[PDB]
């Protein structure tokens, strides 16, 4: 069983100079610690083998964090709210060299989340689906992870049909944001390597561990 009540509780449980690049790296490292506490609260995750928990978090941490700060920014006016508390707007992002990826995040994620009024239960279920990624390489039992994912979007569909009975396509609309999250995550990861490779931007321990094999 995969109760949406616990997934929402997981989202609620992890709720809390002005250079965008440095703040991005600081925010990612900061939220990696919070991501572990979140995953532990997702039903049945901690029951997986320890090595599989590592595989799933190493494979999805980037998308998981991107989904979080995107939904967190639905109230911001054409901007992104990073975990450090810094609001990055279009002018600041463009001047920092990350104008393109910034635009994608707002048009393909933040604005789409705001327009459909994606709630925290739906967000937590999407992040849980991402967490339970059966395509992750090295999983000792990918079928087991696939079963957990199936339970997640089974409970999500039931939630959407009960909460939004007049939006029959809402469930599919939620899942159809995952392709954008996938490609956006890949581009964001490229910028993180731009920041690290140049050696000019500080990279803290946890984020450094995720960026290395």
């Amino acid at each position: 069983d995969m109760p949406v009540e616990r997934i929402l509780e997981a989202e609620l449980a992890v709720e809390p100079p002005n250079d965008p690049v440095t703040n991005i790296c600081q925010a990612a490292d900061k939220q990696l610690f919070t991501l572990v506490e979140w995953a532990k609260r997702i039903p049945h995750f901690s029951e997986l083998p320890l090595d599989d928990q590592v595989i799933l978090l190493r494979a999805g941490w980037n998308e998981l964090l991107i989904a979080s700060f995107s939904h967190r920014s639905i109230a911001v006016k054409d901007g992104i709210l990073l975990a450090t508390g810094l609001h990055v707007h279009r002018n600041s992002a463009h001047s920092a060299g990350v104008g393109a990826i910034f635009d994608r995040v707002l048009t393909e994620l933040v604005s789409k989340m705001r327009d459909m009024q994606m709630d925290k239960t739906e967000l937590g279920c999407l992040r849980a689906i991402v967490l339970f990624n059966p395509d992750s390489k090295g999983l000792s039992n990918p079928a087991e992870v696939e079963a957990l994912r199936e339970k997640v979007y089974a409970s999500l569909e039931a939630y959407c049909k009960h909460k939004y009975p007049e939006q029959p396509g809402r469930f599919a609309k939620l899942l159809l944001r995952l392709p954008a999250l996938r490609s956006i995550g890949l581009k964001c990861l490229e910028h993180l390597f731009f920041f690290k490779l140049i050696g000019d931007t500080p990279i803290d321990t946890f984020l450094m561990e995720m960026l290395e094999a």
Binding site: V36, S46, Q53, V54, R58, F206, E209
Partner: peptide
């Protein structure tokens, strides 16, 4: 460092 992810998942 020292499998910070491993140790964070282990500790309760």
């Amino acid at each position: 460092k020292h499998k910070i992810l491993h140790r964070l998942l282990q500790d309760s």
